[PDB]
Amino acid sequence: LAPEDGSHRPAAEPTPPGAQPTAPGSLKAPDTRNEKLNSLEDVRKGSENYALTTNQGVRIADDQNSLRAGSRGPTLLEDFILREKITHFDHERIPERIVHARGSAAHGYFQPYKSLSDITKADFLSDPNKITPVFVRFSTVQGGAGSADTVRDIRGFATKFYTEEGIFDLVGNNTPIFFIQDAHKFPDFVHAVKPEPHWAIPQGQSAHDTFWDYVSLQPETLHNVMWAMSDRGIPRSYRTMEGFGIHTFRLINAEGKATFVRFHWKPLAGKASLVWDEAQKLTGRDPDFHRRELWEAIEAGDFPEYELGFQLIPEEDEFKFDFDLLDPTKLIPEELVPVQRVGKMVLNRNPDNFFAENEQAAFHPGHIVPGLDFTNDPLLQGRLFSYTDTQISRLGGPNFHEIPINRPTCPYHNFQRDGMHRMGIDTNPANYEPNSINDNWPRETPPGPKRGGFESYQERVEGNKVRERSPSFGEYYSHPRLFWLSQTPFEQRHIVDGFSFDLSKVVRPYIRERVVDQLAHIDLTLAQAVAKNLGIELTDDQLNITPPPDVNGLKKDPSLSLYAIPDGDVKGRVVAILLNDEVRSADLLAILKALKAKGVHAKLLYSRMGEVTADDGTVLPIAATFAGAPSLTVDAVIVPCGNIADIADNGDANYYLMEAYKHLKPIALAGDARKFKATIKIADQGEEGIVEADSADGSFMDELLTLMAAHRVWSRIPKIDKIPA
Amino acid sequence: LAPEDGSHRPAAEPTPPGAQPTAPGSLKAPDTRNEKLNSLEDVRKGSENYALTTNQGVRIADDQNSLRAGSRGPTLLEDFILREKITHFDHERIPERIVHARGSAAHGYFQPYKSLSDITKADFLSDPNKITPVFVRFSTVQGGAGSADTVRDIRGFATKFYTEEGIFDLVGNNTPIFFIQDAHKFPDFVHAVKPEPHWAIPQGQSAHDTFWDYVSLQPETLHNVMWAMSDRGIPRSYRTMEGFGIHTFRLINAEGKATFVRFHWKPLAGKASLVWDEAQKLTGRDPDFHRRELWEAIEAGDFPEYELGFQLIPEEDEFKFDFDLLDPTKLIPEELVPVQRVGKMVLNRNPDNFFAENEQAAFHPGHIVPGLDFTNDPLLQGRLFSYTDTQISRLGGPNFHEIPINRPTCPYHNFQRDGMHRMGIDTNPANYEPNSINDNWPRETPPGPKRGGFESYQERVEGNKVRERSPSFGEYYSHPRLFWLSQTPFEQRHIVDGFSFDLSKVVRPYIRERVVDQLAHIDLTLAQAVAKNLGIELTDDQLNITPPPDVNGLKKDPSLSLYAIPDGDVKGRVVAILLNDEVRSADLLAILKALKAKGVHAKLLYSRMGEVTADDGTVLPIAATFAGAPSLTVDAVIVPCGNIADIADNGDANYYLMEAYKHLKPIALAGDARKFKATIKIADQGEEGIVEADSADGSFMDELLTLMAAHRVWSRIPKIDKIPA
Amino acid sequence: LAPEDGSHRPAAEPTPPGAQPTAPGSLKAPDTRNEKLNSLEDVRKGSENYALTTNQGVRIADDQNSLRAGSRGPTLLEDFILREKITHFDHERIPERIVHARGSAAHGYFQPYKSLSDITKADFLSDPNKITPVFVRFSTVQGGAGSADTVRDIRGFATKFYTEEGIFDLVGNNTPIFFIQDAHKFPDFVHAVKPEPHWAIPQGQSAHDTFWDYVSLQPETLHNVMWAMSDRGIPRSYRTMEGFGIHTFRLINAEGKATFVRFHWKPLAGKASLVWDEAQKLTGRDPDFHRRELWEAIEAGDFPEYE
Amino acid sequence: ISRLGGPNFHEIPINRPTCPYHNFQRDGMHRMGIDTNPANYEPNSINDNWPRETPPGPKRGGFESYQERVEGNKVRERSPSFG
């Protein structure tokens, strides 16, 4: 059924977004390999040139019809071909994850910069030339597997390391703290954020009564709520967010020394988030935006890269801060404990089948390896129970490690047997130890510097059996305040806006008031600006609440801001080029040449599909229409010259610019395209953030690419209130 | 931990029963191979020289202890090694089969004698050089997976053929008919025979009210009930029973011609059954006796062999018989339609792990291949729905064909995706057809002579949509009567005893009377004989019920008897040798040499464990004692000469002989061994079936092996009441 | 279909073993009540005088045939009555218990002799007039749900107390100790006594290599092994064996004082076991002998009693 | 059988008939109804064959399929009239 020209089928080379249909990773990049991807070969199933069969291997002659008694007669029970096909269909679905159901994943590899054997015996960190395959799943938290990507939410960032000494799963989030202190409260918190149980509304949103009810009653939540209400809660891409393990864990070296450690991922593409209006509209225009962007970046060669980093605290410093190291609502400011760079992780191939590899993957923070260990963090402690347990229903049984994506690439042998869907056929005469009948194989292995058995660090435990929160955990305001004061003025404004927007959707007014009261214990300016938007007036008492203390003398920590310290990297970003029916090919040449030199992609847009022909006869295929791929999905907009009259009174073309303008994106206007300055009210002598010139050229591209390096035009904020867009 | 002399490890070569501990098939017989066993290699897991790990590949240091706070303190929730191991244990079991839950399985291979391409295009039957791997599971029907082997029950005989054109499952039983006509009634009959629902008694027995209630009210059951009540219901081993597909199926040749077919398996070892007292006793002494016999035969190189046979009826002969070919309560007498030999099956390797290969195996009579097709048999029709449906809970979901033992060895490719425990990772860009994006692969294949798609035979259907039994099925007594008349008089007596014992356990006297009434419609002598064991007296009306008509002129068919035509073979049978402390080592040499020569095994027994020395100094190792390994488990008993004084007086030795005598087993006595005649009341002149002489040979061993070939000494029956055992 | 005389139906009065067909407890003894049995009334389904229906409440006209095109024709996919009946049958079974799969259970009640409030605040022990419904399941350990009752084995004795302040399950055995010290070894011991993995033999028996391999290498097992090898391993009936919680637990009183406790059940019918040859022969003549004995004792009014 | 975990999905409260339902079906995962019927099969005499089939009738009768004539060969074939 394919067309003549082979163009049903994508080129198996890197291609920019939109240049080719997307494809399964092994067909797209068949030369991209690693030990884990190779090991999946036993279960990869091709298709070309094969006969269509039942699952039992019987060739089907007619896959268009049920078996019936006469061609208008009833379907017959003996049609086993229909019933196998429909049975398999009828049982496709499995329970989605209780939380982080929505997520997107890829393969890649990790390697350390130098050996860490002085601080850890973990084998995967032992040698700068020893590469460890990874599989990474990014996710939201609240919504179902079919909810939208660019919600306001925390994001999950889970890395499965297939090491020589075991699977290590580093199961983190994109903020450095969690909402709650003790795992016992997790069902209460998750139920409060999830859709409400009477009507199962709202999907993918904290903006509802039950969430803000819980928050207002549990001030320990305020720190992660601050991060969620900031632009952290709406990342531009999974490539442009930070990742954190949250908990303090331990590194254990060959000599037995424990060092406390917190884990960080630093996005090498820099930190970048959307703005709210854009993020919310994008949930409607492309609810798959982050899934798509990640797949397309990998297909293009813009591999997501992250630097693993460790905050390291000696054991004797456990009590030296003014917060508890074991409290997952508290961060360790980098001004106090810097992040030591550890290694680099590159994501360089997409999966073959989303369901088989992404939906069935199982990550669990208990999956550690010798050289790592846990602490008493009471959130971390209960997570260790839940991830093994939940897999029993989600993946159908205790043999979930035999599902191909989850399998260790290193040896695994033990005495466990049976369970639903058991794949492994054990030959061992023994299924117990100690045994003589197989000479006690497989055997225990004593702990040691490498290739040793797992032994827990022998932490001293002293206390009575109590259900009690540590007094050291009972402080809730000083870290929210540190985060607040570390944000730029525009970031602070967006935080105020995020709180105001969420609370406006709370139906019960006393709940809004209680949350504003909580804000008054963090920062008066923040409390008042939220109050004003809610038509609430602070009491005298509220205006007099003493600010919480600084965090160990810190008045701000700029590492907590997305933007205070520039780190922008334009490679893999995308520009909309608004075409006309007589495009000046000299502008297009200059634009594409400069974009290509910085790995910035382009999309050619028009008022219909098909082709337009430039002034020099160059035939331009049209990627999408103005309405069909809105400015939400690109980082900047260029309008080349040519026949501007063609698009000058097109409502969609004008709206495209008004939207990109509103959302603080760089805009460049060449030649007569400068006439569009009218729709967005730019001063004749110009505006910082709008690039203009008689033609698109060297200098014009430079100015545009500098603005893109800075991500958005924050100085335009005062001007966007007036535009009706 | 293994002993210094290596005596823990079974010899990896053929050894007779009891010589070596039993072992997993690929460790016992590593040189045995077939295409299926080869393709299972990728999931087989070893053990020697490997480290003990978690399922995530983490080496375990201490597999003897939980992690606790202090060595007498509480267990910690962070012990992930304990929770993984306990979790897998906690979820070991899967539902058992609804029916046939009790069964034993082995690998083997099939080969046809000649090409049958003139009558079928089935590829596995197309070439005398085409060898087809098989996996065969034999079973009882009623009991659980943990019930006894030698119960009275029908047996299952299910063969999975891994053909080049698909899995073909031949899912049969050891009797040629079933209890019921229409699949709709299956839950009724099976509930009736199964343990009663209030108290869940009895296990593995039809001897209870509800079974006989149903039978008494559903005369269509009486034919298979006659089989079950005969010695057919207590086979000596799975090697010495017949198998039958029961239903009429079709062979379809390359030209499109349909031929009606009924399937047969002929045991090359001959047909042989236990007697009731033996079979019931063995359920107590060795409830695994048939599973053990199958395993040990294969370990010895005594492979079970069966001949596939076909009864073939041309389409135009569909109505040529007194009974409906579609009626699964009717058999086709071999005297009207002979069985044509088709091929040989040899079962030559045990599995490696019972649960993974046997318990998870899924057979379904709907799994046919091009060259075979169904008919409208209304029991068969219903089955085609059930065996697909049941696997969704039993085996966890729609991907049960990916469980290794179930996998085809030929190619399988299609558009089905997902489902719980999905192993195959599909790389096809398309998961639908028709598609252009993968040029419509995998593709449909037209039907053809070889390697073609499945098309159903275009049988003509005409009639209204009815829930109605065909009147042609409404005859219940002629087949039961043919079966009865074809039995020898000792077989007839055993049938009488079978009904008599079962009905004796029915509490409600009226159910017994109604079953006696049904018997009077079959045969008066059989009815009177059961009535008299039950203290029931036939009425005048019952005494005058006209017998049912013969079956197409036949008043008997000897192929229906176990024994009427000698087919007895001795290879793989076992003789008890009752030792004394001074054995005539010349007797032993001749005995074992004649036994060896015929492939008969020997088991040396004495009054205690350890050893004895013969007349010439030879050390005789003792396998077990008289009391420890009773006669129940052997086929004959030899008592050699020597110091008979040593055990003439022994209660165990005497009992051994009285049990063996009561169970109709051949006995041979040499020299003073003839003293034993007293215990079993033999007269001096000798008795047919008791072998005697001065020395244990000349023709003392030809005589005894001749008795063994005839299986049991039927003539002894009139004398066994006299002996209290 | 019932006989004219009515002899199909067992009398709703206590009768000795074998005098009447056995029957569902609420039809055999409809006036034996306790609070639990009363609370199950919402889910008990009768049958007499009701029409045969699908599970969706649709009356069935012909429960003897599938729907087919002609009376000798193929079965039609549209027969929802057949498919529902066969679907339910096809999915009847659930996984059996990993251990103690073979067991027999009965309803009853517990009452204390005196208030134990000086040593425990447990509400079901606070007053001798406090009656606590129980459900008790007795079991073997090794064999499947289909295995024989009078095997040599440890027996389970599990009591569910439906108290006014929560379910208390007292999950014990018939000997006062267990085979092993630390729960991490439970899968090793259980795998060793269970049928061996290659061939799944032997059912309901410790008499095999792997069991004795483990015992010989783990001397902590020897105490319970001694009990299993004694006639304790072959009880005459569940009414004539002891029960034990094995572990030391704590009682906590209202003042917060903790007392260590080990739990016992003393059979008021006394202790009695079979002898080996009799037990082993019974596994063949009546593999349901203890299940039968329990059910029939209760039917006769010979109620199992334990202190 | 997968989505709602077994063949007793009709006992999940929202799914329950409000009219009588009785039959010989037993067990299954999540089984809520405790059947007191001495019989779990029909035909039976031990419960006088209850619950009983009901002939079709103008009201409260058993289900019987309309006796449509069926005539043709067993075919996997789209009707030309659908083309």
Ligand code: HDD
């Ligand atoms: C005690 C319960 C509990 C608590 C306190 C947490 N979680 Fe969790 N989390 C789960 C119980 C859980 C889970 C129910 O077990 C999930 C869902 C299904 C699954 O496979 O794991 C899960 C999934 C889940 C995933 C998705 C992994 C994937 O992509 O499959 C991430 C990234 C996180 N969690 C991260 C966190 C972080 C950073 C936490 C706080 C610091 C946290 N979880 C607290």
Ligand code: HDD
């Ligand atoms: C409509 C239901 C139905 C009917 C009428 C039959 N069966 Fe069946 N049979 C099943 C429904 C079933 C089942 C529920 O589908 C089983 C149990 C679980 C499984 O895997 O299949 C099964 C198991 C089963 C097994 C065990 C296969 C194995 O070893 O795993 C054999 C040998 C048979 N059957 C043979 C027969 C024969 C010879 C029948 C009469 C011709 C028959 N069955 C009628």
Ligand code: HDD
């Ligand atoms: C950590 C594993 C483990 C350990 C050390 C034990 N058991 Fe257990 N036991 C189980 C894991 C288990 C189980 C897997 O959880 C079962 C099987 C299915 C179930 O519902 O509970 C069980 C069932 C079970 C039953 C059957 C309950 C019933 O009738 O349904 C009894 C009577 C016991 N056990 C008694 C004991 C005693 C007295 C023990 C030692 C003092 C013991 N168990 C140790």
